[PDB]
Write an enzyme that holds these catalytic residues in place. Structure first.
Site, PDB file in Angstrom:
ATOM      1  N   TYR A   1       3.395  13.996   4.990  1.00  9.56           N
ATOM      2  CA  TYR A   1       3.728  12.359   5.073  1.00  9.56           C
ATOM      3  C   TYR A   1       5.396  12.320   5.094  1.00  9.56           C
ATOM      4  CZ  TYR A   1      -1.069  10.640   4.465  1.00  9.56           C
ATOM      5  OH  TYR A   1      -2.237  10.081   4.518  1.00  9.56           O
TER       6      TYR A   1
ATOM      7  N   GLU B   1     -11.763   3.854   7.562  1.00 14.70           N
ATOM      8  CA  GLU B   1     -10.560   3.267   8.406  1.00 14.70           C
ATOM      9  C   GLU B   1     -11.054   2.460   9.674  1.00 14.70           C
ATOM     10  OE1 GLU B   1      -7.465   5.783   8.281  1.00 14.70           O
ATOM     11  OE2 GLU B   1      -7.847   6.771   6.304  1.00 14.70           O
TER      12      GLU B   1
ATOM     13  N   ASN C   1       6.925  10.224   7.809  1.00 16.09           N
ATOM     14  CA  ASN C   1       7.774   9.067   7.493  1.00 16.09           C
ATOM     15  C   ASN C   1       9.153   9.143   7.818  1.00 16.09           C
ATOM     16  OD1 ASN C   1       5.317   8.063   6.237  1.00 16.09           O
ATOM     17  ND2 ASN C   1       6.052   8.584   4.335  1.00 16.09           N
TER      18      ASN C   1
ATOM     19  N   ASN D   1      -0.786   7.493  13.581  1.00 12.69           N
ATOM     20  CA  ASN D   1      -0.316   8.863  12.995  1.00 12.69           C
ATOM     21  C   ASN D   1      -0.713  10.096  13.769  1.00 12.69           C
ATOM     22  OD1 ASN D   1       1.054   8.042  10.763  1.00 12.69           O
ATOM     23  ND2 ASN D   1      -0.770   8.112   9.443  1.00 12.69           N
TER      24      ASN D   1
ATOM     25  N   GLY E   1      -5.979   2.002   4.673  1.00 15.64           N
ATOM     26  CA  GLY E   1      -6.196   1.865   3.126  1.00 15.64           C
ATOM     27  C   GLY E   1      -6.860   0.558   2.887  1.00 15.64           C
ATOM     28  N   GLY E   2      -7.060   0.201   1.574  1.00 16.13           N
ATOM     29  CA  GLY E   2      -7.988  -0.880   1.193  1.00 16.13           C
ATOM     30  C   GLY E   2      -6.900  -2.022   0.648  1.00 16.13           C
TER      31      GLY E   2
ATOM     32  N   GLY F   1       0.684  -1.326  -0.100  1.00 12.25           N
ATOM     33  CA  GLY F   1       0.175   0.209   0.017  1.00 12.25           C
ATOM     34  C   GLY F   1       0.826   1.329  -0.078  1.00 12.25           C
TER      35      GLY F   1
ATOM     36  N   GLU G   1      -2.040   0.250  -7.367  1.00 13.03           N
ATOM     37  CA  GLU G   1      -2.174   1.262  -8.180  1.00 13.03           C
ATOM     38  C   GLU G   1      -0.579   2.045  -8.501  1.00 13.03           C
ATOM     39  OE1 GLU G   1      -1.705   4.767  -7.815  1.00 13.03           O
ATOM     40  OE2 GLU G   1      -2.116   5.311  -5.796  1.00 13.03           O
TER      41      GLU G   1
ATOM     42  N   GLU H   1      13.721 -13.435  18.650  1.00 14.78           N
ATOM     43  CA  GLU H   1      14.101 -12.885  19.915  1.00 14.78           C
ATOM     44  C   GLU H   1      13.085 -11.666  20.180  1.00 14.78           C
ATOM     45  OE1 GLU H   1      17.783 -11.843  21.858  1.00 14.78           O
ATOM     46  OE2 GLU H   1      19.156 -12.520  20.067  1.00 14.78           O
TER      47      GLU H   1
HETATM   48  N1  GTP Z   1       2.326   7.903   8.223  1.00 15.47           N
HETATM   49  C1  GTP Z   1       2.052   7.622   7.095  1.00 15.47           C
HETATM   50  N2  GTP Z   1       0.601   7.278   6.854  1.00 15.47           N
HETATM   51  C2  GTP Z   1       0.121   7.272   5.571  1.00 15.47           C
HETATM   52  C3  GTP Z   1       1.099   7.604   4.568  1.00 15.47           C
HETATM   53  N3  GTP Z   1       0.232   7.059   3.538  1.00 15.47           N
HETATM   54  C4  GTP Z   1      -0.990   7.067   3.659  1.00 15.47           C
HETATM   55  N4  GTP Z   1      -1.185   7.118   5.172  1.00 15.47           N
HETATM   56  C5  GTP Z   1      -2.314   6.830   6.031  1.00 15.47           C
HETATM   57  O1  GTP Z   1      -2.960   5.441   5.677  1.00 15.47           O
HETATM   58  C6  GTP Z   1      -4.351   5.729   5.598  1.00 15.47           C
HETATM   59  C7  GTP Z   1      -4.674   5.644   3.904  1.00 15.47           C
HETATM   60  O2  GTP Z   1      -4.392   4.019   3.530  1.00 15.47           O
HETATM   61  P1  GTP Z   1      -3.166   3.798   2.149  1.00 15.47           P
HETATM   62  O3  GTP Z   1      -2.269   3.056   2.807  1.00 15.47           O
HETATM   63  O4  GTP Z   1      -2.903   5.226   1.641  1.00 15.47           O
HETATM   64  O5  GTP Z   1      -4.029   3.151   1.114  1.00 15.47           O
HETATM   65  P2  GTP Z   1      -3.749   1.956   0.427  1.00 15.47           P
HETATM   66  O6  GTP Z   1      -2.840   1.067   1.309  1.00 15.47           O
HETATM   67  O7  GTP Z   1      -2.760   2.305  -0.833  1.00 15.47           O
HETATM   68  O8  GTP Z   1      -4.833   1.042  -0.095  1.00 15.47           O
HETATM   69  P3  GTP Z   1      -5.900   1.707  -1.243  1.00 15.47           P
HETATM   70  O9  GTP Z   1      -5.189   3.199  -1.829  1.00 15.47           O
HETATM   71  O10 GTP Z   1      -7.222   2.072  -0.698  1.00 15.47           O
HETATM   72  O11 GTP Z   1      -5.833   0.778  -2.478  1.00 15.47           O
HETATM   73  C8  GTP Z   1      -4.410   6.942   6.020  1.00 15.47           C
HETATM   74  O12 GTP Z   1      -4.624   6.747   7.586  1.00 15.47           O
HETATM   75  C9  GTP Z   1      -3.441   7.850   6.035  1.00 15.47           C
HETATM   76  O13 GTP Z   1      -3.043   8.758   7.182  1.00 15.47           O
HETATM   77  C10 GTP Z   1       2.392   7.751   4.632  1.00 15.47           C
HETATM   78  O14 GTP Z   1       3.141   7.943   3.608  1.00 15.47           O
HETATM   79  N5  GTP Z   1       2.872   7.923   6.004  1.00 15.47           N
HETATM   80 MG    MG Z   2      -3.507   3.514  -2.783  1.00 10.60          MG
END
Ligand code: GTP
Ligand code: MG
Ligand code: G2X
Ligand code: ACP
Ligand code: GDP
Ligand code: CA
Ligand code: CA
Ligand code: CA
Ligand code: CA
Ligand code: MG
Lengths: 418, 438, 54, 351
Positions: free
Chosen positions: B224, B183, B228, B206, B143-144, B10, B71, B254
């Protein structure tokens, strides 16, 4: 590379659609010839969502223009950008619909529909990964109303796993230029309830009051009303057309905005400091549908800010309105207001704020139409013009019941507690 | 030397993975083109850093990593970024349409179409391993793909690699940067499906990361990239023992034996200090006793909770830089007299300590200041269940009305899986209570 | 406060500090749940295309 | 304006604070689970502390301290006192007590001291209590340990045995018993504010040391005086004597004052109890802040020594004093966090 196919049907749909392409073409620095003449390169990173790219770097709108009479199709071709559209995408008949939903849906529109789906299919096949469709149309006429919902139904049959969005001009509470508008609108709503994922409700009386009271145009025209809509369509599609990740595609926006499949009718808004914009965007007098939000509760909301602005101030004031008026947001959907920001501002402004609300207050619009419809249908007034095209009465009875069911649903969620 | 493979799933997983791998390269002296001048064993080796990096005959050092998203926009940045030459394209996997913040769409609909090419590409990495420890899986809860596909792959990894260990780095959802309203749904569903396949998972809310960046780095609106970069520090300090010589946490096994006496309660709280802004031309440096004491203030944890109202089952102190054991025990004894640190009856009140003389490495131009001593503590405290209570409550409010459920049923999942997953969290919230409450 | 199991090397040191002593699914099962999910989707698309055919 | 939610409708004190905050014109009440509040006047049991401090853009305050239960219940208070060095199993102002479980249990240690003093023919009258008993029932007084250890196994919730104060200070006229109630407010800065006005809650029948059967002569609860003896109301209204009257009695009958003879020990006991828990309940570095109003119950023996008997975490005030106290709560504990638009009633106990 997540492409959208745009369709415009009927006079209203085509005139609104035409200027939507004017607005976004300028935003992406496309000129009427289809050649790019812009400054930044975020104008083209997501250009392929709405434009097919062609010969010699000329970008053609992935647009299909549909009507049952050539008149309005000729003005579009005569307009500022009339030249930018693929001439093979002009699909038109000669008979017209006579303000009759049955003609557009069943008889005159039936003969022309397959020609439109031929053009749609050709576009969709040139898409790396098709995302969905958007249609612009009115519901009070015959073509955009009766044929527009016929296209939707045929499109869903060939593309059942794709998103179907519409921008739908609805009947207005007090103004009307045709007598049978309640029949046309009610029949079309029954279609949209079933066959669209997101519908934006627009009415000309609200569009007009903004033009006259706010923008102080002393003699507003459909041209002025359409510039307002086009500017709003640009706003609601900013996250689809420029690099972002909140509501970036049609499906993600629908997952965030539609908690229940039938309640997918939205109230758009537009404005015009940072505390100023966020106050306007939430005010009744900035909604393009003639429904007062304080008569219901928001199930979800999507705010979009454009321009250079302190994202800190924006975040802070979005939260202040939510916490200030907590009573107007359902307590059983946590964090139901999502905000996006785009650096690209619209032309003329520098900071914009487009509002997309899914409020139960929208039931008022379906009750107005339902009251008008029953007043006519109880006496079967003007009905012979519809049954004369082959329709049965129960097709009206079913349409009335479904919209009445839709109204109870909105109120069922307007009173729900945690 | 035993190898570990990292899998980033993701958007969140990918972008965090890319910050970590940039940070690993600086710590080990590996350049953007994979060349490590410090490495004298050309084209091979049994070094500890080899646990994370492969080697080619041409002298390039390749991360034992696979990036997968449904994607291509994010992974394309990796193919185009500062560290593009680091990876061979085989390690980067793209779908074309994502899971639309829909767990059922990433687990069932699209996951089934791609799970198997992912396993082949993973197997391609495992085939190059003489003895493989297991996997470190970076993903998000919301995320999905992060929730839906990750849980599917964990199920498969438990079969293709039944005996290898699996560690998660999960991003817990926070509204201030969250993308989607559902979420809570995706978090509960993926936790339920993944629970019995994860040996130890480090959650990073987060919200906490966001507020640290605001408080201690004076970033008015953290992005982000800001989040990160802070996250990769905490991550790097946790995996340092696998990439450097030492006798503590040198083995993915461990991590579990030291931190997880109870399998289901495998969510250790991470606290990190000091986080000091680099815009301060200088910051009168901090003690061992002060950074160590800062490990017990909630404002430094990766998840905002109150350890005072729970019980510890294990605690590890991972120092970096100028630190010596006598100063550590001095800080511990003085800290036990002023802090509320209650362990469970059935465990010893103690701290396992690891020290790495190499001070923390920072990314040039980042918001973090070069320090000469940093500490990351890993404590398995029941207080982390507060994060489950919050999620479960949000899940409950929406699910009472079945809001958004049609999107999941529309992808082939049954409404029952909602109730099933929530009942599992109900059991987990209660197991955390039998342990840490009277 | 015991200091047990101390280890030292060029890169650092480790030890433990006591303060007080104490007082999965088959691969076949996976596919059969992904297929039952694909069937439920196909049934739903079928009932829609049936009704659209009506 | 600010927002608050009410989650214990059964709170006399916070019912009127709620009414006061709305008269503000600056506070709006939402309902129970609207999470976008500034102030939570929460429930008494299983208050969800884990869900506070996580709403962006909202400073949230709650009217309870997480962990104060260890002080505000019998079994908890006994172990806290005996195991906390700051308080010492040798504590002088707390009557010798022992936690005992029906069917970590000091039943063997309690009988050790019991026989230790019948060997010395000292007073051996003890009492058993617990935080399941309400309405004044669950408590038994006797001098034979067998009668009270059989009585506790007759139960199923954990009780505590504590030495009965056989020589209490008896008010005259009447020769009657009484306890003192002190209300204390702890704000989010952990300032310990003592309400200037306390109450002596009275017994209206002479103190009969001969028989403990009648617990209208021994148990000063407002419960059992209103409801099982007819001279409730003779000496003072509602069996509630207030400090200015009690101060005059002490001067007139014993040539002393309330401040010197009793109040200094009270303030000392309050400080000791709440500062022993500050490390474990303070919220000054937390993502949400806490305040809480407590009620301290004291007994005074004939030598004018003060003893603490229990602390109440969800106390009720006295009807004559609701107005004054409940608004002090607002200015010191609530408007301290949430300022409004623009002497003292508390004794601040320093530390
Ligand atoms: N800390 C941090 N959180 C992130 C980042 N990108 C997305 N998020 C968080 O992750 C969640 C969104 O899910 P994503 O990981 O972007 O979605 P995905 O895994 O790509 O799944 P889909 O896009 O739905 O197919 C939200 O809570 C965002 O705040 C990142 O780069 N750093
Ligand atoms: Mg995505
Ligand atoms: C205080 N609340 C008053 C709101 C007034 O609402 C409206 C809306 C409109 F859309 C128009 C309008 C416009 Cl703007 N341009 C037009 N061009 C051709 N027709 N036409 C319009 N309407 C047709 C029916 C008419 F003129 F016969 F009335 C309009 F005049 C008032
Ligand atoms: N060790 C002791 N010696 C003498 N009297 C005692 C005593 N313990 C309790 N009492 C008396 O018995 C009465 C009841 O005890 P206790 O205060 O604990 O009940 P309770 O919890 O119902 C008071 P509240 O209703 O305020 O919470 C007290 O008012 C006190 O006068
Ligand atoms: N905003 C706007 N609305 C229009 C326009 N033309 C017609 N309408 C509206 O649509 C209705 C007439 O429908 P029309 O589009 O002409 O019917 P159709 O061509 O058969 O689909 C009336 O209610 C008008 O308010 C236009 O140019 N702009
Ligand atoms: Ca014809
Ligand atoms: Ca054909
Ligand atoms: Ca080597
Ligand atoms: Ca396993
Ligand atoms: Mg009591």
């Amino acid at each position: 590379m997540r492409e959208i196919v745009h369709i415009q049907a009927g006079q209203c749909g085509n005139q609104i659609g035409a200027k939507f392409w004017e607005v976004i073409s300028d935003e992406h620095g496309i000129d009427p010839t289809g050649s790019y003449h812009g400054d930044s390169d975020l104008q083209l990173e997501r250009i392929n969502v709405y434009y097919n790219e062609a010969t010699g770097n000329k970008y053609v709108p992935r647009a299909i223009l549909v009507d049952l009479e050539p008149g309005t199709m000729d003005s579009v071709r005569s307009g500022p950008f009339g030249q930018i559209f693929r001439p093979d995408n002009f699909v038109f008949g000669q008979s017209g619909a006579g303000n009759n939903w049955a003609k557009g849906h069943y008889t005159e529109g039936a003969e022309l529909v397959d020609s439109v789906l031929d053009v749609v299919r050709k576009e969709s096949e040139s898409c790396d990964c098709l995302q969905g469709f958007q249609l612009t149309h009115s519901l009070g006429g015959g073509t955009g109303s009766g044929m527009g919902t016929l296209l939707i139904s045929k499109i869903r049959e060939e593309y059942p796993d794709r998103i179907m969005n519409t921008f739908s001009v609805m009947p207005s509470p007090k103004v009307s230029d045709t007598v049978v508008e309640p029949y046309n609108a009610t029949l079309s709503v029954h279609q949209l309830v079933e066959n669209t994922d997101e519908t934006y409700c627009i009415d000309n009386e609200a569009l007009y009051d903004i033009c006259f009271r706010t923008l102080k145009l002393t003699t507003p025209t459909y041209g002025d009303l359409n510039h307002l809509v086009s500017a709003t369509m640009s706003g609601v599609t900013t996250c689809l057309r420029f690099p972002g990740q909140l509501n970036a595609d049609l499906r993600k926006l629908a997952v965030n905005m539609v908690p229940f499949p039938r309640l997918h009718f939205f109230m758009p808004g537009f404005a015009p400091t940072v505390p100023e914009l966020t106050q306007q965007m939430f005010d009744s007098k900035n909604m393009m549908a003639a429904c007062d939000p304080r008569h219901g509760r928001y199930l979800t909301v999507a705010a979009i800010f454009r321009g250079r602005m302190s994202m800190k101030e924006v975040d802070e004031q979005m939260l202040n309105v939510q916490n200030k008026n907590s009573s107007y947001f359902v307590e059983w959907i946590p964090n139901n207001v999502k905000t996006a920001v785009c650096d690209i501002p619209p032309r003329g402004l520098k900071m914009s704020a487009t509002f997309i609300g899914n409020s139960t207050a929208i039931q008022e619009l379906f009750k107005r139409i339902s009251e008008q419809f029953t007043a006519m249908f109880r006496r079967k007034a003007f009905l012979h013009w519809y049954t004369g095209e082959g329709m049965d009465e129960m097709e009206f009875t079913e349409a009335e019941s479904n919209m009445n069911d839709l109204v109870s649903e909105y109120q069922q969620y307007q009173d729900a507690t945690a | 030397m035993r190898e570990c493979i990292s899998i980033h799933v993701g958007q969140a997983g990918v972008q965090i993975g890319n910050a970590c791998w940039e940070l690993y390269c600086l710590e080990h002296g590996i350049q953007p083109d994979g060349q490590m001048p410090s490495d004298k064993t050309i084209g091979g080796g049994d070094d500890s850093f080899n646990t994370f990096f492969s080697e080619t005959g041409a002298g390039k050092h390749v991360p034992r990593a696979v990036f997968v998203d449904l994607e291509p926009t994010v992974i394309d940045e990796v193919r185009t970024g500062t560290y593009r030459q680091l990876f061979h394209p085989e390690q980067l996997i793209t779908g074309k349409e994502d899971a639309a913040n829909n767990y059922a769409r990433g687990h069932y609909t699209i996951g089934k179409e791609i799970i198997d090419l992912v396993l082949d590409r993973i197997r391609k990495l495992a085939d190059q391993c003489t003895g493989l420890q297991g996997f470190l899986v970076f993903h998000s809860f919301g995320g999905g793909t992060g929730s839906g596909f990750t849980s599917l792959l964990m199920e498969r990894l438990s079969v293709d690699y039944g005996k290898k260990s699996k560690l998660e780095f999960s991003i817990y959802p926070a509204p201030q940067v969250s993308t989607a309203v559902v979420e809570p749904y995706n978090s509960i569903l993926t936790t339920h499906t993944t629970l019995e396949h994860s040996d130890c998972a480090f959650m990073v809310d987060n919200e906490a990361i966001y507020d640290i960046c605001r408080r201690n780095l004076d970033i008015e609106r953290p992005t982000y990239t800001n989040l990160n970069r802070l996250i990769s520090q905490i991550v790097s300090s946790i995996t340092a023992s696998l990439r450097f010589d030492g006798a503590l946490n040198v083995d993915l096994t461990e991590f579990q034996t030291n931190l997880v006496p109870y399998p289901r309660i495998h969510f250790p709280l991470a606290t990190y200090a000091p986080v000091i802004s680099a815009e301060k031309a200088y910051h009168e440096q901090l003690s061992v006793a002060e950074i160590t004491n800062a490990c017990f203030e909630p404002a430094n944890q990766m998840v905002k909770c109150d350890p005072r109202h729970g019980k510890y089952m294990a605690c590890c102190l991972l120092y970096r830089g100028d630190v010596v054991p006598k100063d550590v025990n001095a800080a511990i004894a003085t800290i036990k007299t002023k802090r509320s640190i209650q362990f469970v009856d059935w465990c010893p009140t103690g701290f396992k300590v690891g020290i790495n003389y190499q001070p923390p490495t920072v990314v040039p131009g980042g918001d973090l200041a070069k320090v000469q001593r940093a500490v990351c503590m890993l404590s398995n405290t029941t207080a982390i269940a507060e994060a489950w209570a919050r999620l479960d409550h949000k899940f409950d409010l929406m699910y009472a009305k079945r809001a958004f459920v049609h999107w999941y049923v529309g992808e082939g999942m049954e409404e029952g899986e909602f109730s099933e997953a929530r009942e599992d969290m109900a059991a987990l919230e209660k197991d955390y209570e039998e342990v840490g409450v009277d | 406060m015991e200091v047990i199991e101390l280890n030292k090397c060029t890169s650092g040191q480790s030890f433990e500090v006591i303060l007080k002593p104490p007082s999965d699914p088959s691969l076949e099962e996976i596919q059969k749940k992904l297929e039952a999910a694909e069937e439920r989707r196909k049934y739903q698309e079928a009932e829609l295309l049936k009704h659209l055919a009506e | 304006m600010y927002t608050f939610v009410v989650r214990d409708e059964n709170s006399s004190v916070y019912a009127e604070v709620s009414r006061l905050l709305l008269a503000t014109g600056q506070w709006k009440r939402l309902r129970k689970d609207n999470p976008r509040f500034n102030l939570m006047l929460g429930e008494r049991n299983r208050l969800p502390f884990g869900r506070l401090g996580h709403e962006p853009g909202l400073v949230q305050l709650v009217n309870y301290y997480r962990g104060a239960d260890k002080l505000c219940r019998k079994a908890s208070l006994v172990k806290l006192i005996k195991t906390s060095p700051e308080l010492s199993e040798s504590c002088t102002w707390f009557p010798e007590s022992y936690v005992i479980y029906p069917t970590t249990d000091e039943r063997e240690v309690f009988l050790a001291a019991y026989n230790r003093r019948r060997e010395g023919r000292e007073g051996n009258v003890w009492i058993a209590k617990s935080s399941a008993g309400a309405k004044g029932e669950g408590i038994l007084i006797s001098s034979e340990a067998s009668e009270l250890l059989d009585f506790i196994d007759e139960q199923g919730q954990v009780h505590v045995i504590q030495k009965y104060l056989e020589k209490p200070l008896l008010l005259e006229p009447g020769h009657r018993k009484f306890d003192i109630r002190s209300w204390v407010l702890v704000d989010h800065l952990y300032n310990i504010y003592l309400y200037r006005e306390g109450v002596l809650r009275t017994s209206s029948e002479p103190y009969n040391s001969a028989n403990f059967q009648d617990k209208t002569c021994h148990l000063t609860n407002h419960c059992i005086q209103k409801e099982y003896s007819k001279n409730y109301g003779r000496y003072e209204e509602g069996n509630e004597m207030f400090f200015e009257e009690f101060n005059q009695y002490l001067m007139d009958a014993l040539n002393t004052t309330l401040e010197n003879s009793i109040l200094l020990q009270i303030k000392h006991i309050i400080r000791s109890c709440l500062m022993c828990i500050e490390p474990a309940i303070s919220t000054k570095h937390l993502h949400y802040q806490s305040f809480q109003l407590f009620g301290f119950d004291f007994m005074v023996d004939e030598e004018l020594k003060v003893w603490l008997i229990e602390v109440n975490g969800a106390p009720a005030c006295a009807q004559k004093l609701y107005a004054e106290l409940c608004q002090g709560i607002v200015d010191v504990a609530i408007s301290s966090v949430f300022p409004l638009a623009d002497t003292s009633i508390f004794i601040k106990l320093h530390h």
